[PDB]
Amino acid sequence: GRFESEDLTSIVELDGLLEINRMTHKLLSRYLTLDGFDAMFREANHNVSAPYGRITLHVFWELNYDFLPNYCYNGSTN
The binding site for other proteins (CB under 8 A) comprises: 33, 35-36, 39, 43, 48-50
Nearer to other proteins, 50 or 63 (CB): 50
Q: 63: Cβ–Cβ under 8 A, 6 or more apart, which residues? A: 8
- Is residue 9 within 8 A of residue 58, CB to CB? The reply is no
Q: Sign (positive/negative) of CA torsion 63, 66, 67, 68?
A: positive
Number of residues that bind Cl ion (CB under 5 A): 2
Q: With CB cut-offs between 5 and 8 Å by kind, which of other proteins, Cl ion, none does residue 4 bind?
A: none
Q: Decide whether 7 or 43 has the Cβ nearer to other proteins.
A: 43
The answer to whether the CB of 70 falls within 8 A of the CB of 15 is no
Q: Which CB atom, from 20 or from 68, has the smaller least distance to Cl ion?
A: 20
Residues that bind Cl ion (CB under 5 A): 2, 13
